[PDB]
Design a protein around this nucleic acid. Structure first.
Ligand SMILES: Nc1nc2c(ncn2[C@@H]2O[C@H](COP(=O)(O)OP(=O)(O)O)[C@@H](O)[C@H]2O)c(=O)[nH]1
Ligand SMILES: Nc1nc2c(ncn2[C@@H]2O[C@H](COP(=O)(O)OP(=O)(O)O)[C@@H](O)[C@H]2O)c(=O)[nH]1
Ligand code: ALF
Ligand code: ALF
Ligand SMILES: [Mg+2]
Ligand SMILES: [Mg+2]
Lengths: 271, 293
RNA sequence: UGUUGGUUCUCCCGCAACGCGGAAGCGUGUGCCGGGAUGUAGCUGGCA
């Protein structure tokens, strides 16, 4: 049965779940399998799924944007993970549920960021509030939020510039963006969404940690699950921070965003 | 963590006799754990471990002072060996224009890297550089390159999303030959190894311009999946080099080993920031010490 | 258009933070939406 210890250990590790989380899940699995005296494979697969299901059941809360004017979502995370693409997706979704959406082009740093967002705005036939690269991000987003109140907009999604979490000064910048929002709405940002590239390994932990400490994360989006990457690191992060997983990215077209469903995620992870 | 763990295993199993395979057991498992938390893809960890085993059998160890330190010296030496050599360069001495093709997954840092290479090549190798984008997929990608190009004082060959990448690069090469340019940098859209049509596309682009360099660009925070991508890309194109981007982050960077192993190709550059000046040469020992902490 | 609040660029300065550097110092997608000068200037928001 040692070849089985070796085998499942390998399966967990190749999916980027991490060693600590691997020990937790496997240790609980030895106790569960020995306990219920399981003799067949399919039942083992079942129990594994059940326990992982426990971890993900604390983070399955879907996002609700109803009830505020506007409901403010703040997109944060590291570079090139797909924050902007995800916003593009989010808009078509919200427009599908009869919500008027506005976009803030808060990435005022990276080359062509604003034009990129604007393409998502034209694709969504919704307004995009922007100044230029070089502008103050915080003030761009603030102006956006004021404009959304004025125009009775239902959801305002603010893009930020991707930043690495060890760059403390960029995190301070992030904090200003939030702080400055508070002057219009104390409970905004109503959703602070971390975006994690599914290719990412254990550094995601650090990411989730530092952004959290900076800003208080209220949701996660897992992108690029349309490849071979399973994105298992999320278990570790769920274990440590309990952040709701809102959506999954599954491609680059405007329709390639799916509400996060734990069971589908389990399905994908194994095949 | 490293020195102290290795010192623990080495004082506790063996006393003061030479190191023999039965002393090595705990050492090997723990090194494996360290490398896994460092995001080194598993198979690569096994293969490195075996070499470590081989260096462990005939150890000349009982003589140095700290057992952890000598064993560490050997792991470090092995790793620095694995990583390659210094002063690894782009072939700019052959017939001009030197065509450089970028390849890799979405958001890896390819466009940013093209800008960085434009800066490096014009400023330091006194090169006359043309850059082009074949990214007709990601919105505003071309304008992103055009911007970067205008910023680094290099010429930009216009393309639009209504064109086809093969047409674009053929045109670009034609212009570079015709106007006696020293270098053609070719930016492409991020693509997944499972994307059959896009891999066909990159294979065809490479076939069209016969590039002297094909650079595989890889996000340094990449976890296990790097084993897959590397393999696919290595098998899809003749890679001549690797760019590892976002090393200015705090990720341990183990993907570098993984990739380096599976492709056997040299890492030529580190991307070390978002700005165009942020480019560094690859030093095996520095990255090695980073991965081991 | 009318009025105000942002911001950018140009000039001026303060406090602090971060990065690099024996240090002196050089910086700044950092903070105090710091303080001023200025444009006939831009870009952005609110309200009549
Ligand atoms: N294959 C795939 N690509 C994605 C996904 N999400 C984003 N991308 C691509 O990732 C690249 C970078 O994403 P972007 O939104 O510009 O990153 P940002 O810097 O975080 O805003 C873009 O080329 C996107 O098309 C996804 O779910 N699957
Ligand atoms: N911090 C950091 N960011 C980088 C680096 N290289 C690229 N990026 C960022 O990653 C994001 C995606 O870059 P991009 O060049 O468009 O990726 P591409 O889709 O492969 O062209 C942008 O925010 C870049 O600024 C790097 O070395 N360090
Ligand atoms: F390219 Al980014 F946030 F990393 F727009
Ligand atoms: F988003 Al890319 F190359 F992956 F521009
Ligand atoms: Mg973006
Ligand atoms: Mg690009």
């Amino acid at each position: 049965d040692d070849d089985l210890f070796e085998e499942l250990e390998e399966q967990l590790l190749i999916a980027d779940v991490g060693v600590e989380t691997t020990r937790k899940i496997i240790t609980n699995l030895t106790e569960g399998a020995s306990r219920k005296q399981l003799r067949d494979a399919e039942a083992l697969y079942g129990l594994l799924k059940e326990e992982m299901g426990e971890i993900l059941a604390k983070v399955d809360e879907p996002l609700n944007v109803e009830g505020k004017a506007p409901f403010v979502i703040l997109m944060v995370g590291v570079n090139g993970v797909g924050k902007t693409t995800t916003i593009g997706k989010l808009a078509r979704q919200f427009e599908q549920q009869g919500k008027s959406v506005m976009l803030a082009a808060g990435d005022t740093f990276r080359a062509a960021a604003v034009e990129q967002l604007q393409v998502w705005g034209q694709r969504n036939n919704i307004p995009v509030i922007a100044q230029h690269t070089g502008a103050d991000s915080a003030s761009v987003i603030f102006d956006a939020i004021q404009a959304a109140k004025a125009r009775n907009i239902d959801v305002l999604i603010a893009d930020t510039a991707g930043r690495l979490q060890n760059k403390s000064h960029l995190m301070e910048e992030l904090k200003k963006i939030v702080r400055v929002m508070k002057k219009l709405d104390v409970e905004a940002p109503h959703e602070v969404m971390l975006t994690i590239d599914a290719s990412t390994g254990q550094n995601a932990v650090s990411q989730a940690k530092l952004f959290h400490e900076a800003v208080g994360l209220t949701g996660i989006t897992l992108t690029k699950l349309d490849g071979t990457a399973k994105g298992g690191v999320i278990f570790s992060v769920a274990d440590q921070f309990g952040i709701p997983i809102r959506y999954i990215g599954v491609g680059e077209r405007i329709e390639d965003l799916r509400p996060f469903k734990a069971d589908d995620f389990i399905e994908a992870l194994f095949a | 963590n490293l020195t102290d763990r290795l010192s623990r295993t080495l004082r506790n199993i063996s006393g003061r006799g030479r190191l023999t395979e039965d002393n090595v057991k705990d050492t090997l498992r723990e090194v494996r754990m360290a490398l896994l938390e460092a995001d080194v893809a598993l198979p690569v960890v096994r293969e490195f471990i075996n070499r470590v085993k081989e260096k462990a059998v005939g150890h000349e160890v009982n003589k140095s002072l700290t057992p952890g330190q000598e064993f560490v010296k050997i792991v470090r030496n092995e790793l620095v060996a694995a990583m390659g050599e210094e002063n690894q360069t782009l072939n700019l001495a052959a017939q001009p224009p030197a065509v450089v093709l970028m390849a890799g997954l979405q958001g890896a840092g390819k466009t940013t890297s093209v800008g960085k290479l434009g800066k490096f090549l014009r400023e330091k190798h006194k090169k006359k550089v043309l850059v082009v984008s074949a990214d007709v997929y990601r919105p505003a990608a071309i304008k992103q390159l055009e911007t970067l190009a205008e910023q680094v004082g290099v010429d930009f060959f216009p393309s639009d999303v209504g064109q086809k990448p093969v047409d674009i690069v053929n045109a670009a090469l034609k212009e570079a030959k015709l106007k006696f340019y020293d270098v053609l940098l070719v930016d492409t859209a991020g693509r997944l190894h499972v994307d059959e049509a896009m891999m066909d596309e990159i294979k065809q682009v490479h076939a069209s311009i016969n590039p002297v360099e094909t650079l595989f660009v890889v996000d340094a925070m990449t976890g296990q999946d790097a084993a897959n991508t590397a393999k696919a890309f290595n098998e899809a194109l003749p890679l001549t080099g690797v760019v590892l981007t976002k090393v200015d982050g705090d990720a341990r960077g183990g993907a570098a080993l993984s990739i380096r192993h599976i492709t056997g190709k040299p890492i030529k550059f580190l991307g070390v920031g978002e700005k165009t000046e942020a480019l560094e040469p690859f030093h095996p020992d520095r990255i090695a010490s980073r991965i081991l902490g």
